Amino acid sequence: MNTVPFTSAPIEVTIGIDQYSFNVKENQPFHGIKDIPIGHVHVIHFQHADNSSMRYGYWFDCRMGNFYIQYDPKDGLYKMMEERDGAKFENIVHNFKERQMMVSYPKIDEDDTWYNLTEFVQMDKIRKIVRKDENQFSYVDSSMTTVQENELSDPAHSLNYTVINFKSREAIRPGHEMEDFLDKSYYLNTVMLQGIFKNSSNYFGELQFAFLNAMFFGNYGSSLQWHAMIELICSSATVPKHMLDKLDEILYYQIKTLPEQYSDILLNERVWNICLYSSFQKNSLHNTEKIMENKYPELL
Amino acid sequence: GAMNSSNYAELFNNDIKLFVDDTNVYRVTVHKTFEGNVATKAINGCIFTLNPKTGHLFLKIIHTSVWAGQKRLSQLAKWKTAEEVSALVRSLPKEEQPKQIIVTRKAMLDPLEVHMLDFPNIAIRPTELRLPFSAAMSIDKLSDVVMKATEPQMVLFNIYDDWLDRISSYTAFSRLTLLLRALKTNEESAKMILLSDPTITIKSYHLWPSFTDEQWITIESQMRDLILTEYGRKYNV
């Protein structure tokens, strides 16, 4: 179990760690988060009490270094940083635990939610979507735009998701216009899985990362990407059977963890009714279908 | 954007554009089987592709053989239409290719867009207009060539005959739409109106009678009267 210490908490802020969040008052004695489970990526995010706009946060993996938070009063935000000096870090963390000023990552033992939401998410893949290679952690926020979004403006601050476009040459083979548009199996299986992603685990990882950026930051372009990767599978007649079963589990926990009062903007009516009720895979998402019906029967 | 009564005169500017109507591509009679079930029998169809500027009617004849052994034929018909329109554009020299294609039914948008992926600078547009192009098979010469075809064909018609020598594209288009609207609402009376006077004839390469300017006015008036009456009957007004 690892620790993300905080230098101080000078401004009133709602802090999140994965699917948990805590309210911290201006200059409240707060020096970080302990007992963070090793073996998964994590995200630590922020919403200032004064500006409900711009949620922001950092994706990180504690196996990849020692990381801490410090408020920057010039740039006006809580910044993640890496401590290279291991002994300086152990000592900061020990002093803060001894004075019991750290909150404990509050994992229920029976609960696999975070694992289920991040099963396929790798930090090495996050870092290729969020390009900033001088740091081992990745910044994301509400307003960042995606590469596809930027085609239709600052590239350093883009989310480099894989571009999916059903009405593109990449998606439609010459001579197979109707076939490839009504049955996206060749685009899913040959172009994306074999060509670009290499395997389904990387595909599932980007899909999972997109959903989480949409949920935690209200990032609209991540939400477009998530729905797009769902719809590409649902609109393929020919999907490996292991992928469909895993997709059903993935979507189930995403739908289970979503804030109930956010389903209006985060969930796209057309994609879901199509995937669940018209698509080739309308009958392969039993669990996802059951939780959507019992929880958002209005959407459908 | 979408084409409507506000941006109507755009059809007659000097940007090449085509209307595409797919209503008569897939045509069936419906009949009873020996066992008392219902089956369809297809007949020859056509894509109606019209330059509203010159009068060119690129009529692509859709032979019943294109449906043989195929399923979901009303959906295929839309893709076949898009395939044939795209092939036509490819066959044309660059300076003859349209800058816009306006489809009369929105279901054609995605099939055409997909088939035209190679022409990113051709705009594909729907329209809010209720154009009467479905009535094209009420034009005797066009119906005849479609029904007699024994193979796929493309026949180039001048749907304005020689009108542009005397009137503008705008006025020619309005005359065409008025004739087709009349044929669509009451084919019998519409055709009675056009052929009542045996002294008026149709030029061998032309679709409509040789009316003088004043006869066209009388005809155009008779066609309006027809279209209004039929409307009273329709609704009870």
Ligand SMILES: COc1cc(CN2[C@H](c3ccnc(OC)c3)N[C@@H](c3ccnc(OC)c3)[C@@H]2c2ccnc(OC)c2)ccn1
């Ligand atoms: C591929 O196009 C064609 C066209 C036709 C032949 N058409 C037709 C046409 C007209 C009427 N009935 C038809 O009943 C088969 C076919 N359109 C003609 C035409 C008219 C105006 N501009 C035109 O183009 C700008 C064309 C032309 C034709 C044939 C015979 N006589 C003509 O006389 C001078 C002219 C036949 C076969 N192939």
